[PDB]
Write a protein that binds this ligand. Structure first.
Ligand SMILES: NC(=O)c1ccc[n+]([C@@H]2O[C@H](COP(=O)([O-])OP(=O)(O)OC[C@H]3O[C@@H](n4cnc5c(N)ncnc54)[C@H](O)[C@@H]3O)[C@@H](O)[C@H]2O)c1
Ligand SMILES: NC(=O)c1ccc[n+]([C@@H]2O[C@H](COP(=O)([O-])OP(=O)(O)OC[C@H]3O[C@@H](n4cnc5c(N)ncnc54)[C@H](O)[C@@H]3O)[C@@H](O)[C@H]2O)c1
Ligand SMILES: NC(=O)c1ccc[n+]([C@@H]2O[C@H](COP(=O)([O-])OP(=O)(O)OC[C@H]3O[C@@H](n4cnc5c(N)ncnc54)[C@H](O)[C@@H]3O)[C@@H](O)[C@H]2O)c1
Ligand SMILES: NC(=O)c1ccc[n+]([C@@H]2O[C@H](COP(=O)([O-])OP(=O)(O)OC[C@H]3O[C@@H](n4cnc5c(N)ncnc54)[C@H](O)[C@@H]3O)[C@@H](O)[C@H]2O)c1
Lengths: 254, 253, 253, 254
């Protein structure tokens, strides 16, 4: 559907028919991944807690898009959602650990219950999702995992300690997983966005603030993220593992 | 009788109130002994009661052992409040308690992951949260997060421990910014392969670390403690947000 | 007959003007061939005239070989100006020319150091300086600095080469900021141990890199070229100031 | 002399009588090193192109301070200055590569002659000085090298490409030298300052700008640098090599 963003004009033959799985795929950046992979002719499954948003997107993208309802805090349902994907299409080729929650919170405000919840939606699934797809990949001898990272912890960003600390956690989980699974043919990297404009006056000011702080004087959008994801998924990046790829218009270096 | 760990003397450490988690054994013990030798008032937390009691008794009246399982945040909070009740606001927090037991990626259950994160990461946040208001009232404080080179070197077979350690690398930066306007500096102390209490199997493993290191000698707990004293003292007053790596070059191979 | 290096097709590369130093052989050749396959106009510089001539002849009318010894800044400037005269402003500069010959710390003279810095670092600055005004007039441009993991891994026995490579790591960041307001993005492409044209001695060394890598296969020039195409294309339009490391995990050990 | 800053109250017995060599020692940060080591009772030699500044400082600090005139661009004189130090006191214990020139310069303005000169005063000496002191150290089985680094290249600071690129060069030269010389007992690290107030209206504003950007809301001065240098020199840091130690009040993380 010409209504839905293709995100790039580039064509990656190596993505055709690969099985892709994206968590938090129904909105924002996750939606752009879902769109971009479908446009390259992958078989794309995504998970999201918003069922009516997920259903609309699968309906718009057609039969090579699959929407599986899932709350990533429930590891049981996450492993079930994985098993379903592997049942329908085979072993996953490309896992994108994207689901996350970046609501702001002062350090003094944080209760034990909040911290545990935030760690569960922000960090713990990426581990269990990678744990779930790994053996299928290993059986085949190949696959790719992308962990969505953030420059927020790199820039020491205050006021959201559970989210920045999870993002920092994934930076390290990428390296060690890379080592643990590389012998099996599985490459793992972190895609690290800067300030991506989405849909999640004073808005104009905040937007100009980013442009003033960035090296490249235009705003980043979800397309910039998906363009990096397609490269990281494709055979073009087959020797890259353990690494961060930062798409942030220079905002992390100031 | 006690390991003093350095002949250096830091006048700025005299009388400072120092709180260390997992202080009864290993690295944490070395911190406890080193800061006591500098004249600090040192409170430490540990779930090993017998080890903690013995150590406090051996070090005397400027050591205080509080029993605490760091997974229990309420007890952690209570231990902090009691330190502040006895000696006033903490000057120096060292988030040290950790469990680095090996575990294969394939075998980790939800429950293991939650517990390993709670032992290895969660408490460092809550301990910081507990000491911050007392620090801010006084206008000064230092926090030291014990880090690890293991995640930097992509070390396999202990994903919960390395991921926690990588978590604290980020938590250092962001809390440094969030609290530094209150006068609180926060850094991570990042050791390499520290020797701590098949003879050939041990000897061989120890030789392998020497062979891979740039400096050809084994590191021990004293190396750690000497870095911590500097990171606590007024000599590092302007350092915040940073890692300081004591690893004989093991991380650069 | 030619290595195309990828089956990927980047429409944004069609007709772009690409300048590569040390393009006649090895990695630089792979760049030359890969961008020509995408429909770009590719100019390359090299001191090996016979290799450059043959390559331009083999690739045809959208390849231009300019003889150039990159230590000679005046010639470097002249080659840039001639590219701009034939095809207009450069779209994509790849600072590639380097010499990585081994040399012991103890034995390096002033003259060796100066020459090794001139071959390995200086030209990348001047080449950037030469292409920047033409980029700025058009409002867009990309620069790629070929980096190395060797300094990151503290590799001994070639101090001039590793120090140059570490120099470009910093030069990437600062030129990214200085030129990005003009629309010019700058990144470093950082390969691991790339196979390029005692059999047991070679086989063993190659096996050692496989053993230390995370992915168990040897990297080649094509791996490099496929990253460069992405870093040149509109797919990386928002990436600047950054390293992109293609090393099969060799740098994380 | 009570007139001269001691920089710390800390006492390091392991520094007593060690031989220290500092390039660009007569002014600013280099002067603070010279003062701090003398106060710990080291034998301190420094090099500087400003003879009358160097003479004044050696006169003020007394007989365990030695001032050797030197233009660090002249590698010959630098190796001679080293040989003199080793002749008078033995092998150097602690080398601090501090001399540098941070005049601003637009990228378009830079001529070949400028670039080569700047690289010579900013980078090339640190290599040759480390080359000169190394064999004496190796003979003894011990020593320490500190390379003065800068957060400027880390923060992608524009308008001084020769200086930031040299600083970036030394970041890498620290790692590789660490490996090359570690078997000999020589440890090498980079001391990396933030915005240090020195003596090198609108000044007040610029100063407030740093405080606003820093995490810790006070200015850094030369003492902060020397306090780190003494630790890096002493036996207290005997297991630390190959590393950066950044003293910048959080300015690099923003
Ligand atoms: N916005 C940016 O500038 C930016 C920058 C850096 C990193 N990122 C990262 O990009 C990724 C995508 O972020 P986004 O901005 O599109 O977020 P978003 O919240 O706009 O959309 C993410 C999706 O995740 C879903 N989701 C949230 N909780 C979930 C749960 N428990 N189970 C299942 N689905 C759940 C949301 O409903 C939504 O569908 C995240 O990893 C985030 O950290 C974003
Ligand atoms: N040993 C090394 O090579 C090494 C290397 C890198 C980093 N580190 C870091 O050093 C720090 C100290 O480590 P160590 O090697 O001495 O560890 P250790 O396991 O020997 O000792 C840690 C201490 O914590 C206590 N402890 C553990 N769990 C606890 C809990 N739930 N409640 C209370 N106390 C608890 C233990 O009883 C022990 O006294 C840790 O943060 C570790 O991450 C150690
Ligand atoms: N080979 C690897 O494993 C590897 C690893 C990391 C980084 N790199 C980087 O890859 C880039 C390409 O390297 P390579 O391995 O193909 O090197 P190479 O030495 O095989 O080829 C470099 C090319 O530059 C040309 N050249 C050298 N000096 C020149 C000069 N003064 N004037 C003009 N041309 C000159 C050569 O003639 C050759 O064609 C270099 O920047 C190197 O730093 C290579
Ligand atoms: N100022 C800061 O905020 C800051 C920040 C980061 C790094 N640094 C670094 O700190 C170190 C000291 O800098 P500073 O600010 O005190 O500089 P300064 O210029 O104030 O004093 C440095 C000394 O070096 C001398 N010198 C310069 N050229 C020389 C030459 N060719 N031969 C011999 N001596 C020479 C100067 O005359 C002076 O005596 C340098 O390595 C600099 O990069 C400074």
């Amino acid at each position: 559907s010409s209504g839905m963003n293709r995100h790039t004009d580039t064509h990656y033959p190596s993505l055709a028919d690969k099985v892709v799985l994206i968590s938090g795929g129904a909105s924002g950046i996750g939606r752009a991944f879902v769109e971009a992979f479908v446009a390259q002719g992958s078989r794309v499954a995504f998970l999201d807690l918003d069922a009516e948003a997920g259903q609309g997107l699968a309906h718009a993208l057609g039969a090579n898009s699959l929407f599986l309802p899932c709350d990533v805090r429930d590891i049981e349902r996450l492993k079930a959602c994985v098993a379903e994907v592997e049942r329908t299409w085979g072993a996953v080729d490309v896992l994108i650990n994207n689901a996350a929650r970046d609501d702001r919170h002062a350090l003094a405000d944080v209760s034990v219950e909040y911290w545990d919840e935030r760690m569960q939606t922000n960090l713990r699934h990426a581990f269990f999702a990678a744990q779930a797809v790994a053996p299928g990949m290993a059986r085949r001898g190949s696959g790719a995992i992308i962990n969505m990272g953030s420059i927020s912890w790199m820039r020491g960003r205050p006021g959201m300690v559970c989210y920045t600390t999870a993002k920092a956690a994934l930076n390290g989980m990428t390296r060690t997983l890379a080592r643990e699974l590389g012998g099996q043919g599985i490459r793992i990297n972190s895609l690290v966005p800067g300030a991506i404009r989405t849909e999640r006056a004073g808005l104009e000011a905040a937007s100009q603030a980013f442009i003033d702080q960035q090296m490249l004087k235009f705003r980043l959008d979800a397309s910039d993220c998906a363009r990096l994801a397609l490269f990281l998924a494709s055979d073009d990046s087959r020797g890259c593992t353990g690494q961060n790829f930062v798409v942030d218009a220079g905002l992390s270096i100031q």
